[PDB]
Amino acid sequence: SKGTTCQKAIVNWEAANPGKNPSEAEEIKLIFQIPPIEKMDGPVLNTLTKCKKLSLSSNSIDKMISLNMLRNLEILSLSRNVIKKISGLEDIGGTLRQLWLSYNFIEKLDGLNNCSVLQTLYIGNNRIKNWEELDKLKDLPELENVLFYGNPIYEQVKEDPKLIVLKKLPTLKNVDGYIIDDSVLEKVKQI
Amino acid sequence: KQCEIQAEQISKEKEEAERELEAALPALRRAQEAVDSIESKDIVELKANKKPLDIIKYIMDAVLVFFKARLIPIQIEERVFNKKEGKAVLFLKESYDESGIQTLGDMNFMKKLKEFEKDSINEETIELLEPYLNQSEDWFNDTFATKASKAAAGILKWAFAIYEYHQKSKIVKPKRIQVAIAEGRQAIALKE
């Protein structure tokens, strides 16, 4: 019922920070608002021209919007929201290096391919019920760090997550926290 | 003589920056002990709790953001929760509908929390947890966390410990990288 207003939340956030400037901050902390932020407004967000790390985690956001008008965004943190679809990210695709989106309701990775510069993708505890999404995900030439722990597909996997994950993507260097291992690579080869 | 003067200036800058880097490296060690030290003690209490309070749930959400699995989402199924004896309504994303049940069922939860990849930027996770950080004082406060349950305070500390460790690691790499570039230039100058 429109409980949370970004401007309202933003005003409180700006006041709490007490920073003179609405858009000077490199890390804008909008996480854990009480009541939760529901749906973000692109126009309000647009003023955050200096932001390299946008923290919107622990809210009740249902969708993704207002990608455009963002110029320095490198880390987009949206974990523990109500998001179902990866979309509306073209506006930050040129700069976005990390997407943190664990504890949401994402079952399809369609649309992730736009984040051509993505290096880190954290998406624990989402839905994900097929390695089909990974093939789409692979097109990410810079992806090095991936987190899938908690996903439904992993549960149906019935095999060690760390090994299979390494096998699935050559590009990833770290999977569910773990560093590349010679032994791990050998195990993957055996598998 | 010009090379020697440049080397001396580089060395003074290197020493001050090295002292900053050394402080950061102890801060990182303390942060690593904080989450690693909690072991499964906090996890056992969370499993034992079964149906935790909304304030306790918020601490779990921060841990869930790092996990990046089935995170709840721009406010669906989110309502204002009363805090302590104060009738205050605060807007939030709310706890994950079914992410906790799947995480609780897995016996690798201790294995998941116990091992974390080092030097992880977590830019996507920090942006997601950025809103939580501004409101952290209201529900992630240690006094507030301890009041709901002993285990809830540890989980919030566990989530907080990892964030502090990540910030320390970023400073250690970047400020350390500037010091390192200066040191490399100084080393080339020294060979010359």
Numbering used by the authors:
A (entry chain Q): 2 to 192
B (entry chain A): 3178 to 3369
Quote from the publication.
Axonemal outer dynein arm (ODA) motors generate force for ciliary beating. Each HC of the axonemal dynein consists of an N‐terminal tail domain followed by the motor domain. This includes six AAA motifs (named AAA1–AAA6), with a microtubule‐binding domain (MTBD) connected to AAA4 by a coiled‐coil stalk, similar to its homolog cytoplasmic dynein. We analyzed three states of the ODA during the power stroke cycle using in situ cryo‐electron tomography, subtomogram averaging, and classification.
We thus have obtained an apo state, depicting the post‐PS conformation from a nucleotide‐free dataset. Our analysis shows that in the absence of ATP, all dynein linkers interact with the AAA3/AAA4 domains, indicating that interactions with the adjacent microtubule doublet B‐tubule direct dynein orientation. The tomographic map suggests that the γ linker is in a Post‐2 conformation, which was observed in neither MTBS1 nor MTBS2. In situ all three linkers appear to be in a Post‐2 conformation. MTBS1 fits worse than the MTBS2 model, which has the β and α homolog linker in a Post‐2 conformation. To optimize the fitting of the MTBS2 to the cryo‐ET map, we performed rigid body fitting and real‐space refinement of individual parts of the structure by Coot. Step 1 is the translation and rotation of the γ dynein head including the MTBD. The linker of the γ‐HC changes from a Post‐1 conformation to a Post‐2 conformation. In addition, the stalk of the α‐HC adapts to a more straight conformation by a 1 nm distal movement of the MTBD. The resulting MTBS3 structure is shown in Fig 3F–M. Through this remodeling, the cross‐correlation score between the 20 Å filtered MTBS2 and MTBS3 structures and the cryo‐ET map increased from 0.6797 to 0.8402. In the post‐PS conformation, the stalks are upright and extended, maintaining a certain distance between two MTDs.
